[PDB]
Design a protein around this ligand. Structure first.
Ligand SMILES: *[C@@H]1O[C@H](CO)[C@@H](O[C@@H]2O[C@H](CO)[C@@H](O)[C@H](O)[C@H]2NC(C)=O)[C@H](O)[C@H]1NC(C)=O
Ligand SMILES: *[C@@H]1O[C@H](CO)[C@@H](O)[C@H](O)[C@H]1NC(C)=O
Ligand SMILES: *[C@@H]1O[C@H](CO)[C@@H](O)[C@H](O)[C@H]1NC(C)=O
Ligand SMILES: *[C@@H]1O[C@H](CO)[C@@H](O)[C@H](O)[C@H]1NC(C)=O
Ligand SMILES: *[C@@H]1O[C@H](CO)[C@@H](O)[C@H](O)[C@H]1NC(C)=O
Ligand SMILES: [Zn+2]
Lengths: 596, 195
C-alpha cells in the first residue's frame, strides 16, 4: 500500500472520530449559550478540551504522511489543513508564552474600564458604556474623552504585549515556511496545482490594492459630502480641506460611518422604510419571521428547514431566570443538526437578520455531504457574503410589498432611494478604506517594514493618507491604537471584511441577472427565481472542496475578485454625490489636525 | 395453523449491530405477509423478484429474517448491487436477491441524549463481503506495512466504529431498524406457505 492509500485510510478514521467529538463539543457549547450556568461552563470546557486535544494528536499524526507523495488533490487539501496547526511547531515554552499573551490581551480588551474625572467609582466599560458615547453622543468633548481614554488607559496596556505577540507569531509563521505572520494569514486565498485557477499569497496584496484604487473616487466623494455636513454641525472643529477627526465617526474607531446618518441624511423630510409597525399590527412572532425566511429560500429552489431546526433552535429569549448569549448565530453541529440561536424581537432589523442567519444555514446544509474538513466556505469571505445578499433582497420595497408588510400604495421616489444608498454607503463603503488600511499596517508590521519606534507614527500617517481620518490628540509610541480594536487584540485577520464586501455584490449582480431583474441593482429581489437559486447552489455545495477561484466562477463567471459590481450598486449615489460636491473640496490635506 | 414468529424479530427490545447482524430461520409456520406490507408503520418496504402485493399466495422452503440497525442515509445500501461502508464491510445482498427489505425509524428507541454507543459498524476490511457473509472479527486493521501487535497506533486502527446516536441528530444520521426477508426455494418440502 502506498503513502496516499495510507492517507485516505487515516482521514477516514479522522472524519468519523472528529465528527463525533465535534458534535459533543458543539452540543455542550450550545447548552451553555442557551442556559448560562456554572455547570454548563464546565461541560463546555471539558468537551472543548477533548476536541482540542484530539486535534493536536491528529495534527501530529497527519504530518507523518508527507504531502509530496499525495496526488489526489481533494486528499491533499484535507491532509494539508490538518497539518498546519501551530501548537506543535514552536517550543513548548514559546507556545506557552504566546497563549498567555493572547489571553491577557483578550482579557484587557473585555475587562478594560475607564473612569470619568472627579469620580473614580463611576467607570465605564467599552460595551456598553463607551460604545454608547461613540454611537449616540453629539457632544465633541464627550466623544473626544471616550476616544482618548480608551486608547490611553487600555491601549497603552496592550502595547508591550503586542510587541511580543508580533515577535512570537512571526517565529511560528517562519517555522511553518511562511515569510511572516501576515503571509500566513494571506494563505487562506492560496491555490496550487489547478491549471487556470491558481492563486498566490502575494497576488492578494496586488488585487486588494488594484481594486481599492477604483474604490477611491467613490470614497473621496462620500468623504467630501460627509465632511461638509459635519462642518455645518461642527463649524469650529472641522477644516473644509482637512481629514475628519477620528472621534466624530459614529463608533469607537470609525470602522463604520453608520451613525453619521442623522447628521448626513440627504432628505430629512422623507422617512425610512420601517415595517416594524406593520409586523406588530399583524401580530407577527418570531416563528412567523423565520417561517417567512424559510419561504424565501424555498421560492428560489433551496430546501426546507429540517424538522430538527424548528424543534432544537432557540428563536426567542428563554425568559427571566434562564439567561442566554443573545448574539445571533447559525450552528452547524454536524450529524445533520442545524440550529439558529437568536433572541428575536418583532422588528425589521431582526426580520432581516433571520434571512442573514438562515442564509448561513443553507450554506451549511449545502456542503454537509463534503468530508468534514471541507465543510466550510470557499474562503474566509464566502460565508458572510452569502448571508449579506439575503438581507439585500429581503429588505427591498419590492419584497416587502409581496409579503404584505409594505402597503401597495407606497411608491419609491428618487429621494428615498438616495437616502437608502447613502445609509448603505456609510456602512459598506466607509469601512473599506478602514479595513484595507488596518490590514495593510499589520502586513507591514509582520513584514518588518515598520520599526517599533514608528508603529504609531506610521499608523496615523496611513490613517490621514488612506482613510482621510486624523487623530484628535498626538500619540507617542506608548500607545497601541490598532490593539484598541477587538480583531487586532484578539488575533483575527481583517482583510476578510474587504474581500467579502466585493464578493457579495458580485454574487447579487450575478443572481439578479439570472433572475432577469430590470432596473438598478439595489432594487433587485431574487425571490421566486429558481435559476438564481440553482446558480447559487452550484457554489454552495462545493464547500472547500474546490479552489475559491472556481467556486466564485460558478456564480459570477469570473475567476477573481472584482470591484465593478460594487460600483454598479452605488452608481445612483455616486452621480448624486458628485453633483453635491461641485462647490466643495474633494480630497483632504494630511497636515491639518485638530490640535494645531 | 401455526403462526410464524415475526414478532420476535420486528418487536425485539434490542437489535444487533450491522457488523454482527442477526439471522432467524423461519420454518413450519403460517406467515401473514399482508399484515406487514399493509401496516404503514415502515418507511421502507421494497421487494426484489417477489412482489409485496398479496404474495402470501406462494410457498418457500425456508425464510431467513436478518435484522440490524444502521443510520438513515445507509438504508439505500441494503439493496442489490450497492456499494458503501455497510454494503462492502457489514452486510451484503446478492445481485440476484429474491426477497424484501423492511426498515423504519427508531430514534425513539436507539437514541440517547449524550450518545448511544451500543450499535457499531465495520469501518475497515481487507476486502469486500460475499453476499450474506458475516464478519465479527475484532483484529486491528493494518493499513501500513509495520505489524500492529494487537493494539491500535500509527496506521493501525481498531476496525469497529460506533454510531453514537443522539435524539437531536438529523434524519440521515438517526437510527433505522432493518429487517431483510430472504426467500429460499430448494427441491425440498417447502414448509412455509401461509394463507
Ligand atoms: C409488534 O407489536 C404491535 C403492537 O402490539 C403489533 O401490532 C398490533 O397487532 C394487533 C393484532 O395482532 C392489533 O390488535 C394491535 O392494535 C396492533 N398494535 C399496533 C401498535 O400496531 C405488531 O403486529 C407486532 N409486530 C409483529 C410483527 O407482529
Ligand atoms: C437549562 O434549562 C433546562 C430547561 O430549559 C433545564 O432542564 C436544564 O437543567 C438547565 N441546564 C442546566 C445545566 O442547569
Ligand atoms: C480521490 O479519492 C476519492 C475517494 O478516495 C475518489 O472518489 C476520487 O475520485 C479521487 N479523485 C481523484 C482525482 O482521483
Ligand atoms: C419541504 O417542502 C417540500 C416540498 O417543496 C417537501 O417535499 C419536504 O418534505 C419539506 N420538508 C420539510 C422538512 O418540511
Ligand atoms: C412570488 O410568487 C408568489 C406566487 O404567485 C406571489 O404570491 C408572490 O407575490 C411572488 N413574490 C415576488 C417577490 O415575486
Ligand atoms: Zn453572519
Amino acid at each position: 500500500s502506498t503513502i496516499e492509500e495510507q492517507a485516505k485510510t487515516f482521514l477516514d478514521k479522522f472524519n468519523h472520530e472528529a465528527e463525533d467529538l465535534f458534535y459533543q463539543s458543539s452540543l455542550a457549547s450550545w447548552n451553555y449559550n442557551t442556559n448560562i450556568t456554572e455547570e454548563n461552563v464546565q461541560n463546555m470546557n471539558n468537551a472543548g478540551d477533548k476536541w482540542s486535544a484530539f486535534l493536536k494528536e491528529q495534527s501530529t499524526l497527519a504530518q507523518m504522511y508527507p504531502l509530496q507523495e499525495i496526488q489526489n488533490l481533494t486528499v491533499k487539501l484535507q491532509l494539508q489543513a490538518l497539518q498546519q496547526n501551530g501548537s506543535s511547531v514552536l517550543s513548548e515554552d514559546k507556545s506557552k508564552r504566546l497563549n498567555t499573551i493572547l489571553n491577557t490581551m483578550s482579557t484587557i480588551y473585555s475587562t478594560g474600564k475607564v473612569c470619568n474625572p472627579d469620580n473614580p467609582q463611576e467607570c465605564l466599560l467599552l460595551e456598553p458604556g463607551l460604545n454608547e458615547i461613540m454611537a449616540n453622543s453629539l457632544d465633541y468633548n464627550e466623544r473626544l474623552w471616550a476616544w482618548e481614554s480608551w486608547r490611553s488607559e487600555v491601549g497603552k496596556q496592550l502595547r508591550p504585549l503586542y510587541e511580543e505577540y508580533v515577535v512570537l507569531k512571526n517565529e511560528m509563521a517562519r517555522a511553518n515556511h511562511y515569510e511572516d505572520y501576515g503571509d500566513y494569514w494571506r494563505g487562506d486565498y492560496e491555490v496550487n496545482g489547478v491549471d487556470g485557477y491558481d492563486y498566490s499569497r502575494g497576488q492578494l496584496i496586488e488585487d486588494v490594492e488594484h481594486t481599492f484604487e477604483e474604490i477611491k473616487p467613490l470614497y473621496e466623494h462620500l468623504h467630501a459630502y460627509v465632511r461638509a455636513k459635519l462642518m455645518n454641525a461642527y463649524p469650529s472643529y472641522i477644516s473644509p480641506i482637512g481629514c475628519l477627526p477620528a472621534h466624530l465617526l459614529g463608533d469607537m474607531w470609525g470602522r463604520f460611518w453608520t451613525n453619521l446618518y442623522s447628521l448626513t441624511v440627504p432628505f430629512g423630510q422623507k422617512p425610512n422604510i420601517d415595517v416594524t409597525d406593520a409586523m406588530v399590527d399583524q401580530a407577527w412572532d418570531a416563528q412567523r419571521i423565520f417561517k417567512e425566511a424559510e419561504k424565501f429560500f424555498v421560492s428560489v429552489g433551496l430546501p426546507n428547514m429540517t424538522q430538527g431546526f424548528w424543534e432544537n433552535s432557540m428563536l426567542t429569549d428563554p425568559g427571566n431566570v434562564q439567561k442566554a448569549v443573545c448574539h445571533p448565530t447559525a450552528w452547524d453541529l454536524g450529524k445533520g443538526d442545524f440550529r439558529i440561536l437568536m433572541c428575536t424581537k418583532v422588528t425589521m432589523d431582526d426580520f432581516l437578520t433571520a434571512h442573514h442567519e438562515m442564509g448561513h444555514i443553507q450554506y451549511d446544509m449545502a456542503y454537509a455531504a463534503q468530508p468534514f474538513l471541507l465543510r466550510n466556505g470557499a474562503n474566509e469571505g464566502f460565508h458572510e457574503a452569502v448571508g449579506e445578499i439575503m438581507s439585500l433582497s429581503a429588505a427591498t420595497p419590492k419584497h416587502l410589498k409581496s409579503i404584505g408588510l409594505l402597503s401597495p400604495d407606497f411608491q419609491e421616489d428618487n429621494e428615498t432611494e438616495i437616502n437608502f444608498l447613502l445609509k448603505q454607503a456609510l456602512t459598506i463603503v466607509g469601512t473599506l478604506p478602514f479595513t484595507y488600511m488596518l490590514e495593510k499596517w499589520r502586513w507591514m508590521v509582520f513584514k518588518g517594514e515598520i520599526p517599533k519606534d514608528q508603529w504609531m507614527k506610521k499608523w496615523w500617517e496611513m490613517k490621514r493618507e488612506i482613510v482621510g481620518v486624523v487623530e484628535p490628540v498626538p500619540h507617542d509610541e506608548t500607545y497601541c491604537d490598532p490593539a484598541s480594536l477587538f480583531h487586532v487584540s484578539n488575533d483575527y485577520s481583517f482583510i476578510r471584511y474587504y474581500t467579502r464586501t466585493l464578493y457579495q455584490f458580485q454574487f447579487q449582480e450575478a443572481l439578479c441577472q439570472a433572475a432577469k431583474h430590470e432596473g438598478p441593482l439595489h432594487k433587485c429581489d431574487i425571490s421566486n427565481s429558481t435559476e438564481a437559486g440553482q446558480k447559487l447552489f452550484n457554489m454552495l455545495r462545493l464547500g472547500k472542496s474546490e479552489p475559491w477561484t472556481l467556486a466564485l466562477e460558478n456564480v459570477v463567471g469570473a475567476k477573481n475578485m472584482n470591484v465593478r459590481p460594487l460600483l454598479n450598486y452605488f452608481e445612483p449615489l455616486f452621480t448624486w454625490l458628485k453633483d453635491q460636491n461641485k462647490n466643495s473640496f474633494v480630497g483632504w490635506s494630511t497636515d491639518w489636525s485638530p490640535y494645531a | 395453523t401455526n403462526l410464524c414468529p415475526f414478532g420476535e424479530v420486528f418487536n425485539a427490545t434490542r437489535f444487533a449491530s450491522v457488523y454482527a447482524w442477526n439471522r432467524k430461520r423461519i420454518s413450519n409456520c403460517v406467515a401473514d405477509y399482508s399484515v406487514l406490507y399493509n401496516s404503514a408503520s415502515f418507511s421502507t418496504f421494497k421487494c426484489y423478484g417477489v412482489s409485496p402485493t398479496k404474495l402470501n399466495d406462494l410457498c418457500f422452503t425456508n425464510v431467513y429474517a436478518d435484522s440490524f440497525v444502521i443510520r438513515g442515509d445507509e438504508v439505500r445500501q441494503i439493496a442489490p448491487g450497492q456499494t458503501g461502508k455497510i454494503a462492502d464491510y457489514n452486510y451484503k445482498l446478492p445481485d440476484d436477491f429474491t426477497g424484501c427489505v423492511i426498515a423504519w425509524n427508531s430514534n425513539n428507541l436507539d437514541s440517547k441524549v449524550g450518545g448511544n454507543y451500543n450499535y457499531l459498524y465495520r469501518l475497515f476490511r481487507k476486502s469486500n463481503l460475499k453476499p450474506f457473509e458475516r464478519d465479527i472479527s475484532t483484529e486491528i486493521y493494518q493499513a501500513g506495512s509495520t505489524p500492529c501487535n494487537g493494539v491500535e497506533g500509527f496506521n493501525c486502527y481498531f476496525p469497529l466504529q460506533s454510531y453514537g446516536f443522539q435524539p437531536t441528530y438529523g434524519v440521515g444520521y438517526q437510527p433505522y431498524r432493518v429487517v431483510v426477508l430472504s426467500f429460499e426455494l430448494l427441491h425440498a418440502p417447502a414448509t412455509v406457505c401461509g394463507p
